[PDB]
Design a protein around this ligand. Sequence first.
Ligand SMILES: CC[C@H](N)c1ccccc1O
Ligand SMILES: [Mg+2]
Lengths: 152, 153
Amino acid sequence: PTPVEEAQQKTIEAITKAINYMAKRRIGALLTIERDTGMGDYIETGIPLNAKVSSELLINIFIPNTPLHDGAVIMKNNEIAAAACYLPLSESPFISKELGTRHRAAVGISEVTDSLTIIVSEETGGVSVAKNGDLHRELTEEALKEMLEAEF
Amino acid sequence: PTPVEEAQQKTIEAITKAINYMAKRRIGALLTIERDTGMGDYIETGIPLNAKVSSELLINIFIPNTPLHDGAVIMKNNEIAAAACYLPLSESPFISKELGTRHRAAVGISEVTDSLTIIVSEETGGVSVAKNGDLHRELTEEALKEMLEAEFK
Ligand SMILES: CC[C@H](N)c1ccccc1O
Ligand SMILES: [Mg+2]
């Protein structure tokens, strides 16, 4: 494939490996992938990383009770742009009432951008995605990978 | 001050803040700063980051029982080049006998490069620096700062 396509595939492999690891351990996570709507305003609220993606770095960021774990990681293409970022909280009535701030933040950013946000619940380990104002819950590993591949 | 000087001071402050946090909690850490001797061969053994330095990222890297905490962070050109890197273990018979692998790795890289390596002991939280084959132990915060400033001058 082209180098761009191979890089995308490595980035998807890194994300899915990290999400699977965190889901199994009930490590809460909030990971927004910038698409065509620029997210600079939100990136600038966090700690700048501009780091190459790896499953290892993604996992290390979200370990509970650490400086970087609260708030969103925002990725730009094949880089982790920043961690511990603010995202706006959705007021949508279609967010399950038991869900906390990570899911509301994910839906919130999905209402004002075309980004794709992945959430791992610290309560259940369930994996969800927010896109275009909708939250899709309880994703299998296969469904998440397919969503990421389709998102390119 | 110049942009480069302000950048160097910001990086020193980020390092010292992270080392203080880890020393207080007795979190083992191993952080090598590349100088004139290139360390690409050791950087290539770790996980690539090429990340901006922050105290927060340094702390998150070394949290125990995590993917990135085992091995050395190597800094180059004011960035974190890679984490979980291999460094060669010193065979020097003159390292304190109570010290283990992190300290021997720091002394080892210091024997074959002009780099400066910071170690935090997981046993005591003591802070030490390896340079030129020697280990400087039980450093105060002021002593570590002076070494970092002397190195970057
Ligand atoms: C308890 C931390 C300790 N005072 C320390 C912290 C950072 C650097 C050196 C050093 O001796
Ligand atoms: Mg369902």
